[PDB]
């Protein structure tokens, strides 16, 4: 409810990569990089960030989580939480108020980097005069200057389906 | 008072999907030879919304304390998807102006197939599980054909922005350019509504998600390739005609869905793949190919 | 190796993806397109060394316009010094809508 | 497996090394690994045992860390400086997560607990392409980075692989994990010239591919996977005898043979720098990783282990296959040491 | 009636071509008076915005001035550059010390508004 | 022949063959490249007054320089 | 470094045209068409030279042109003009095919009494040519000269001194 | 220095160890690394819209769907492990050994 | 953000309801798996395609019409190639 918005949505999209990199049941895994997907288009959005960001939540979120519980759900189950999980989305939840705290109450944070401590609203452009949609025109490329680029995707692709059906007993 | 703009979204598609229930059951009784039943309300009202009470109060046999996670997350996920998505639907003037809402719709289709797929995984390891499997499987093998139906009729639109639709629906509608490319989006919103003949609790919620998806789909029917001519300081008009529309294609989607066997999953599956997806390609390039021969691209502002 | 058919056959193929102050699609600039085109222009027949130690000044110019580094170190160093007059209690300060 | 699929997928492994050695731009670099690795998986699992399968599971899994952390490395780099440009990087983090990432790539010393084991598994042929491709393409990527590394980490892997596939390979009597130790100690090799001169570094890489094409012939020509099959092949020919002597003792790096070109040339553009201590300690590494190629030699064409017969019924039959290219690569590999002042081919 | 079917199908396809195509170019120099509106309009709005981003620069210049008093160092006007060129500011040079409500009008506003 | 056999696919082959071959033989494809181009997203920008040009106008409603009309003209 | 240098607020007031977004959309062609033959001198000086707080001059100058012209149609034909503007402006996004009876009313007004030809479309549009008075810039990005260039090495070539001054293999 | 960047590079060290350190399962590996995927892309996007770097657009694009086919890949190569056996555990794999 | 009000408040009322609604009573096929991975890659291709609309007004339209031609016919090959070589059947 305040300014710090990309802020926000950053801290409880860490919040759910630590929540499923703390190696749950997969099926929870895969809930938890839903959650983590959802507030990272956020984020992407809350930088606009119009086109592309939900553009992947159709792909990423549409088109990977599904095959990914499918094969998950039909493979194996194993019904049973663990203490060493349990342990490990402590130690993630510490790091994460650790920096939060050093972020609130410094200036910078050193990993590397000199981080400035304040949520970024600044930098940011300064209206400028589009009328066209910036990155709208960008993935609106690739068609009349993508000569070679989308000949080497769709060229893998193809690779790939008959890559998935050798594996999978070609023919 | 945009909070009053939400009320005034989500309290009448409630209704809207109990009296959905009452006018499908009874064009059933009128279509196949069962003049009734209308005694519990006078012509049936009082016994849908008494149906909606009794399967909120009904006991419940209680099977249901297994992984209060997911059993929790899957009605939440199916019922807000279905009760949040008539935003971007622009009846007349929208919800929110959104840039880019067909994708949207999209992307929450699919979030839909996620919400089968967590009611399947809590449905304990099952021939039910099994089943499940194939209904996600036969619903997500239309979301290719869907999307690229939908690209190709929004090609002429030029953009997302479907403020752009209703600007080129007004000389013709777009069922008369694509008359083909609507019959296979038409059969791809039956696969997808997943009813005939394309075929635990809260049975009452994911039925409730089950029909406002319908009408969700009817009513992005209505605009994408009806309609009526917009008219502004004038609104209600085209909300007249809008809902005449939409209401006229949900009987007629009643009408197929009486009239017809299932199929087998062999024929589904060999009828999407081996009869849509080279049919959808070639009616794909040629509306691509087509603004090139007639000098008409589209004005993307 | 560094083959250059790339530049053999006379294919731009990966000379457009590259580079800041290219054609873009509609003609239209970058955030810090000046910046590179001073620097490039500084470093074009230079042999990556004396490029290091002849260039500099633009290149700390350019990563000072990307990242904008030390502004907004001056901005926090401002806001800090605000917050400590501020809670000594010296001018409820009008410079917002005011003098 | 048509001949038109393995047709195409060879070809798609030639494409992309092609794109990782063309381009300008890192996206293709990232993309030439990635289709390099999408088609050298059904290479693999040409048999159907389940040995192929858990061997492309592990380096499916290598592969892919090593293409994510290049691709941070990339992010890193426009993070700073930006442009998408293959030259000097503007990070010692990013050239840190690079140099890690190829290292993985082709394989160092902490990183190859995947090479013998994905190389015990398969056939010949997937290893032979794997090894000369997948050990040639990421070399035009580091000769390209090369102005922009911290020096120890090239040299401390460098050294580290030496030793390691120096003293692991002394307790294998399997052939594909003592060539896979040759393997990484070459890597080792190219790997420790890389901030001197990188055309020693690049004519290494082609003495070892041809030197591992006769190594890989010599027993495409006859199926073995143990030293006794090979004493074997001592009973029923005898010129493949002669011909593993002299590319083993090739291997080995012996003056009047041509596999002493690449390390003591490698020698001379260290050691016009001040380093010395560095040179000898690789170098006695060098005496290390030849034992193995000299009990190699004493199983096959020195002394003669005795032989079950059904020789006696192979006898009748000629070893009738077709060799990929034998004699032409053997006498280019072995018979190669006058010409060292081809070494000024490849500028 | 197949053949008959069949024609009568094309034939409504093709009037809806032909329809289209008609519309698509009325709309299409509909687009290009929406250029002109914007063509002719500009130069007034990039004065405005020169003036603006102008003032917002030299009240804070002074603002600064008034509050970085009591520091050693700090010259009022730093640039942070080294190069003499008017670069464009962040908002952070022209949205600061404003407390919230403006400068989430501004900043944020056009992302979360339509 | 084919057409009792399989007859969607031999549609959609007939249709896109169509839809590859007929882009070349048409009487618009000239005017889809000019009416793409000839739209202005940018300022055409004002340029220093003389090399002596018979071109660049200097006023808007001078006709003489390179103007569309086909627009209009059908 | 080298400090800022801003005009302050003795310079920075003109008085600005106070009429909001959709009359000043409305009266878009009359205002290319009367004025906005000075208005390139200003965008000229604003694309050659990449600083303002150099051409605002000019733009005081465009400013008063469109406060003049703004005048102009207040005093001559007509009072409908208002009546256009209230009619493109509840029109949502401001289509020009909505009110276009009004705009052919204020047509024939302007024709009456002021002439005015609305420019055709697209006329607004054809790169135009204007005098100045100021002189043409060398180096807008205020950098310093170039470093140096490189030794170019030519001439023709003698073969090698002794072949390869390897160990041996002299020749 | 863009605060948020510190988050999602820390968010990507998360998902790594995750990658890294993995107990008796390759699905939750797998599903780690298409989270750093994930990582990367919004890493990458922030970055290109921050810097109206318009034309190389194509690298978050570009970058999610090749390696999502790089995840399509290992998924049919845990089935074939899981087929081969009768499950996926990382456990089971101890033949074929170094 | 205010779609983000939208959404809250009907997570807001459908978790109430069915708190209400809760708390208030008073093998494998192999078959089945290649759709998925199949679903997977035309789709990827999907997200290659679908910014042709964006895309359909440049300079060069004939560049556009030869690689958008390009990548269905991609497609086309890769769903007639699985289709030839019997791999998506029963
Ligand atoms: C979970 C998050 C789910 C978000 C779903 C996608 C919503 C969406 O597309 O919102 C778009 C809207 C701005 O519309 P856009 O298309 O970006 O047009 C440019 C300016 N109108 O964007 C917005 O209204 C703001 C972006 C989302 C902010 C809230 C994120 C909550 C988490």
Known sequence: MMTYIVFILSIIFVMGFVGFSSKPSPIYGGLGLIVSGGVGCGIVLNFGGSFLGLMVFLIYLGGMMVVFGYTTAMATEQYPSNKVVLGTFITGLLMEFLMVYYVLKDKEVEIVFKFNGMGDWVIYDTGDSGFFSEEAMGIAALYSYGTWLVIVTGWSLLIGVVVIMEITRGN | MFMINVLTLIIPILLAVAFLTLVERKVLGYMQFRKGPNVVGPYGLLQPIADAIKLFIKEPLRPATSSISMFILAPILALTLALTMWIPLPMPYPLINMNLGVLFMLAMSSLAVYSILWSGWASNSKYALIGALRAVAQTISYEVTLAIILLSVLLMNGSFTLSTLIITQEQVWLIFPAWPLAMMWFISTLAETNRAPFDAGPFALFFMAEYANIIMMNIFTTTLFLGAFHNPYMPELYTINFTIKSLLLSITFLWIRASYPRFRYDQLMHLLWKNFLPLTLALCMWHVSLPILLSSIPPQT | ?99 | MNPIILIIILMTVMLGTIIVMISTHWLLIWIGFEMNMLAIIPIMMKKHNPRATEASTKYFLTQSTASMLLMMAIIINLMFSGQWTVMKLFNPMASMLMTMALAMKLGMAPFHFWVPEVTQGIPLSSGLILLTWQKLAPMSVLYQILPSINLDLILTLSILSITIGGWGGLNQTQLRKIMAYSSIAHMGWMTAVLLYNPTMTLLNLIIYIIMTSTMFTLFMANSTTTTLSLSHTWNKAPIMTILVLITLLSMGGLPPLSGFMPKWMIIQEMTKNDSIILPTLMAITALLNLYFYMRLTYSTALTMFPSTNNMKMKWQFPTTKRMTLLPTMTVLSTMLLPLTPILSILE | ?114 | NVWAKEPVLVASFAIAGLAVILPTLSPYTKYSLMINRATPYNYPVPLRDDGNMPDVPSHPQDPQGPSLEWLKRL | ?171 | ?98 | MNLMITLLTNFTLATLLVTIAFWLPQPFSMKFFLVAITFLLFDLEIALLLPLPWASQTTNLNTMLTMALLLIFLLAVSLAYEWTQKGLEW
């Open chain 3, 1 to 99: 190796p560094f083959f250059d058919v790339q530049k053999k056959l006379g294919v731009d193929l990966d000379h457009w993806m590259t580079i800041q102050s290219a054609e873009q699609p509609h003609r239209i600039p970058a955030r810090c397109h000046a910046f590179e085109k001073e620097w490039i222009e500084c470093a074009h027949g230079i042999g990556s060394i004396r490029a290091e130690k002849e260039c500099k000044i633009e290149f700390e110019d350019f990563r000072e316009c990307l990242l904008r580094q030390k502004t907004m170190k001056r901005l926090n160093a401002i806001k800090r010094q605000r917050d400590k007059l501020i809670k000594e209690g010296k001018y409820t300060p009008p410079p917002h809508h005011s003098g």
């Open chain 5, 1 to 114: 009636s197949g053949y008959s079917m069949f024609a009568v199908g094309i034939g409504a396809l093709l009037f809806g071509y032909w329809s289209m195509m008609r519309w698509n170019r009325e709309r299409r120099r509909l687009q290009i008076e929406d250029f002109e509106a914007r063509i002719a309009l500009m130069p007034l709005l990039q004065a405005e915005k020169d003036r603006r981003v102008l003032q917002m620069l030299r009240e804070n210049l002074e603002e600064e001035a008034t509050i970085m008093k009591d520091v050693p160092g700090w010259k009022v006007g730093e640039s942070v550059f080294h190069t003499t060129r008017w670069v464009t500011p962040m908002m952070g040079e022209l949205y600061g010390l404003r407390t919230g409500e403006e400068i989430l009008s501004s900043t944020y506003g056009f992302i979360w508004y339509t």
């Open chain 7, 1 to 171: 470094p080298g400090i800022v240098e801003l005009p302050s607020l003795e310079d920075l007031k003109v008085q600005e045209v106070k009429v909001s977004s959709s009359v000043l959309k409305a009266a878009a062609h009359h205002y290319g068409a009367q004025c906005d033959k000075p208005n390139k001198e200003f965008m000229l000086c604003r694309w050659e030279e990449k600083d303002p707080r150099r051409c605002l001059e000019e733009g005081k100058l465009v400013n008063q042109c469109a406060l003049e012209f703004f005048r102009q149609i207040k005093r001559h034909c007509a009072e409908p003009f208002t009546e256009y503007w209230t009619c493109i402006d509840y029109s949502g996004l401001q289509l020009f095919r909505r009110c276009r009876k009004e705009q052919a009313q204020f047509d024939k007004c302007v024709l009456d009494k002021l002439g005015w030809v609305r420019p055709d479309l697209g006329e607004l549009s054809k790169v135009t040519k204007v005098k100045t008075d100021r002189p043409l810039p060398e180096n807008p990005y205020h950098s310093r000269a170039r470093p140096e260039p490189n030794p170019e090495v030519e001439g023709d070539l003698k073969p090698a001194r002794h072949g390869s001054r390897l160990f041996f293999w002299t020749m």
């Open chain 8, 1 to 98: 220095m863009s605060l948020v960047y510190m988050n999602i590079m820390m968010a990507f060290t998360v998902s790594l160890t995750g990658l890294l350190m993995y107990r008796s399962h390759l699905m939750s590996s797998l599903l780690c690394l298409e989270g750093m995927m994930l990582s990367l892309f919004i890493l990458a996007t922030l970055m290109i819209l921050n810097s109206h770097f318009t034309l190389a657009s194509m690298m978050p694009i570009i970058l999610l769907v090749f390696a999502a086919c790089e995840a399509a890949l290992g998924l049919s190569l845990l089935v074939m492990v899981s087929n081969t056996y009768g499950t996926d555990y990382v456990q089971n794999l101890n033949l074929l050994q170094c």
